[PDB]
């Protein structure tokens, strides 16, 4: 019989790759906060205590 031969063989192309995934990490940056804590306290001064 005429039996088959080896397959054609995959034609493989060498190369370099970079694989990118979806970015879920937040964009981070250094900020600076200027503010003023205003604390006003009302005290009742008793005879012995406050």
């Amino acid at each position: 019989r005429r039996c088959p031969t080896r397959p054609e063989g995959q034609n493989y192309t060498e190369g370099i790759a970079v694989v990118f995934k979806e970015n879920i990490a937040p964009y981070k940056f250094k900020a600076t906060m200027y503010y003023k804590d205003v604390t006003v306290s009302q005290v009742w001064f008793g005879h012995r205590y406050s």
């Binding site: 604390t39 306290s41 005290v43 406050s50």
Partner: protein, 50 residues
Amino acid sequence: QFMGIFEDRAPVPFEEVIDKINAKGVCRSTAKYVRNNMETTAFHRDDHET
């Protein structure tokens, strides 16, 4: 009408933890604690210590 409700959390002094709560099962009715760099005393029901 309410014109203000100052709600605060004061700690329990050690002499009140070991002598009163763990031993006798009772707690003092007055809170003497340092807050905003001042030692304030709060009496329950505006009455004497109990």
